[PDB]
Every structure is written in structure tokens, then in C-alpha cells.
């Protein structure tokens, strides 16, 4: 499936000093007309390890995918996060060209549902699977004002996959301030990509089936 969400407009990413230079990405960028949305999430290299941070309101970011070719000739690792559980898997995924976690309504009861088949078409010769409490916890609370910041570190050099994370409140606008598991995965990691969740509903005559829409989302990256 994976209808080809893509955008013509692209810009040289701005960067800020982390208090080293870290590049700043916009995933969904609002138009001055408020009309069009820019879907773009590049693949990126993985030089030894990566520092990842974002500030977020609405669960737009749900996990990451890691591998080398990101296709059926090789293993790849996938992390994705429900409202209630994380699941971690190694399988020989066939990723499509623009993966996202689609979510849609299910009229026969009052529920929203999301489906993994919008990110891959098939899996085979799968091996490792694990489940736990979620990583993308909401902060236990702050009354807005950039109500959270979340930071992660990924490291693989030792022959293991290691996550680190922290959650903190914050105050400063639009800039970085001056203010969990160890997995025995056997894999070669060289590139990675983040996956968003997008929602669709039928509410107005004559709209396209590609109704997929989301709010603004942004994140920062920097290499070890």
C-alpha cells in the first residue's frame, strides 16, 4: 500500500549548538496558507551512535526502524509503541518506500485502531521479540509551557543494543536549554529512519482517499 506521501519543497536544515552542531528537522510544516503540509522524513546514516531529542504534544512520533538496506535481503530492527505497550522485533521486514503507522476509525464500536501493514508488506524468518511498558511515557505532568523534553541515546558498538533515556520539564522557547533496556540483538546497523503516525477520517464530500493529516512535529539529531 503506502501511498506516496512526498513533498516538492525542501530546505537546508538549520542547526544549533547543543551547549557541537546538531541538525534540526521539520517533519510536518504548516503553510502560510495553512493549506498544504510537507511530509518528509529522510533516512540518515548511523556513525557509531546517535543522540535524539524532541519536544512533543500529541504522540505524533511512535518509534524508529534500523537496519542496513532496509529490505528483504537483510534483517532489520523495528520499535513501535502503543498507548499501553512497546514491542521490539527482529524480523526480515519488507519495508515500503514511505512507512507510517496509519490509524483509522472502526464504526462497529467507539474505537480508533491502527494497522502495521501500512509500513511493511510481509515478514519472514523472523527471530527476536520482546514486550514491555512504553518508552514514550507522558511526563507525570506540567501545565504546558513546553510541558516536556525527551532525550535518547542509541549505542551498538559492543555487540549489544543499548538505549538510554531521560524525561524533563523545560521553559525556554524553540531551542535546546542550559536547563532503558539492553538487547542481545545480532545485527549490522548502518542507517535508520523515524516513523510517524497519521490519521484519516471521512467528513467532507469530494476529498481524496489520501486524506492523511497530522499536526506539526520536529526533532533534533546529532552523532557520537
Amino acid at each position: 500500500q503506502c501511498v506516496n506521501l512526498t513533498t516538492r519543497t525542501q530546505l537546508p536544515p538549520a542547526y544549533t549548538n547543543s551547549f557541537s552542531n546538531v541538525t534540526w528537522f521539520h517533519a510536518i510544516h504548516v503553510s502560510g496558507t495553512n493549506g498544504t503540509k510537507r511530509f518528509d522524513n529522510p533516512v540518515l546514516p548511523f556513525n557509531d551512535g546517535v543522540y535524539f531529542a524532541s519536544t512533543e504534544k500529541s504522540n505524533i512520533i511512535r518509534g524508529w526502524i534500523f537496519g542496513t538496506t532496509l529490505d528483504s535481503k537483510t534483517q532489520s530492527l523495528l520499535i513501535v509503541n502503543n498507548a499501553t505497550n512497546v514491542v521490539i522485533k527482529v524480523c526480515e521486514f519488507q519495508f515500503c518506500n514511505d512507512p507510517f503507522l496509519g490509524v483509522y476509525y472502526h464504526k462497529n464500536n467507539k474505537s480508533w485502531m491502527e494497522s502495521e501493514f501500512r509500513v511493511y508488506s510481509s515478514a519472514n524468518n523472523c527471530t527476536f521479540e520482546y514486550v514491555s511498558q512504553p518508552f514514550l511515557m507522558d511526563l507525570e505532568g506540567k501545565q504546558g509551557n513546553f510541558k516536556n523534553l525527551r532525550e535518547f541515546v542509541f549505542k551498538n558498538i559492543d555487540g549489544y543494543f543499548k538505549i538510554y533515556s531521560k524525561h524533563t520539564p523545560i521553559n525556554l522557547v524553540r531551542d535546546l536549554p542550559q536547563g532503558l533496556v539492553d538487547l542481545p540483538i545480532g545485527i549490522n546497523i548502518t542507517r535508520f529512519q523515524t516513523l510517524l503516525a497519521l490519521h484519516r477520517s471521512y467528513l467532507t464530500p469530494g476529498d481524496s482517499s489520501s486524506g492523511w493529516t497530522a499536526g506539526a512535529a520536529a526533532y533534533y539529531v546529532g552523532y557520537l
Epitope: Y104, Y105, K107, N108, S201, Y202, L203, P205, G206, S209
Partner: antibody
Amino acid sequence: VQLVQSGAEVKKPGASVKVSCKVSGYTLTELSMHWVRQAPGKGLEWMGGFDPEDGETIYAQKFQGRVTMTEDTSTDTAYMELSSLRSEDTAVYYCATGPAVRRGSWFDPWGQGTLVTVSS
Amino acid sequence: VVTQPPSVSAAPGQKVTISCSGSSSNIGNNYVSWYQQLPGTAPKLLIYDNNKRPSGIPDRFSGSKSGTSATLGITGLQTGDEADYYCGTWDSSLSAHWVFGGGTKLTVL
């Protein structure tokens, strides 16, 4: 959304009938479904359909006993079936759809219609 | 049942109006919508929520509500518009259901 429904049928009185609506470019579970009838030269007559407020199918007062509705959610076809045909049942039957999260005021895509005739 | 006039008549370019009227239960309580049917072809949605036009509808069409009646305004009449027009609404009775008006033929001289 695109719709295609099964072609015309010719039968003798007292028979039942079943027609299908195939929905494509979208998934059936998001859509409300309705059936509407036109006899020759007459106005449109609504037969029944799903009501968002009930989470249930609703039937038109004159038909209640005669009509049934079902789905193959494995092949996203809706079905409608009618018993006890008679000559004044001869009409063109249309498939139409609308919003499901709220009671909409409209049905936007309509099928091409199909004509059922019964004689002798 | 909501009432409608049987027919209306004019030459090209003049004004004409279509009128749909009935109980407070049908028209008054809820929104109205309007449909056009060409002879031998499936109906098409024209206007919804009293006034909004979906994409591609020309400007010559407008809609209004008048208590428990509602009306359609046509501008610039062109000879292609030999068609039926129907109002439709929900019914707010305990016998809650959708209702279509009797339809009107538009003829142009």
C-alpha cells in the same frame, strides 16, 4: 470512493433477490451505507440503512419485515436482500454512502443503479 | 411528507426559485440538502448544510432556509439545466428517518 454494484436480474413473482455493492479506494468499515429506490417516473424512496446514533441498521417503515442487510467484510462487499418479490417491486436500486462519525446531511457517491424486472 | 411544486418555467437568464416546505420536524429542526438528477443518470449532490457548495459546483447555485421551508436560487439559466431537483433531510420523529421531497421538473423556454 468508488462504487460498483451487480447487474440487473429478471425473475418471477414471489422470488427473493440479492444485490451487491463493491467499494474500492477505501475501506468499508469507515463508511455508512444506505439503499434508495426509484420506481418509473416516481420520486426517490429511501429503503433503510445504518444510523450512526444507534450503531445499528435501521429499516424504512413500509419494508420492515421484507428486507435484510449484510456484509462480507472480508471482500468489502455490502449486500441487500429482499423477499417475496411482486411486480410493483420493479424499480432501479441505488447504493449510496455517507459519513459515519456523525449524522451527515448528505450521500455523496452514488452507484450507477441496477434495474430489477419481474413479469409473467 | 414535505411538499414541493410540480413545475417551474422561465427563459434563459431570468431568475427562478424552487421551494420546499413542510413540518417543523422535517425542515425546522435539521439541516437540508439538495440533489440534481439528469434523465437516465445517477443523482448528484449539489449543496449541503443549507449553503455550502462542494468542489466544482458553479456559482449560479445558492440555498436558503426559511423556518420550516427552504429555497433554491438559480442564476444565468442555461438550456442544459432540464433536470429534476429534490430536497432531502432527516426526520426527527420518534419514527426517525430520512425523507426526500416530491421533486420538481424545471422547464426552460
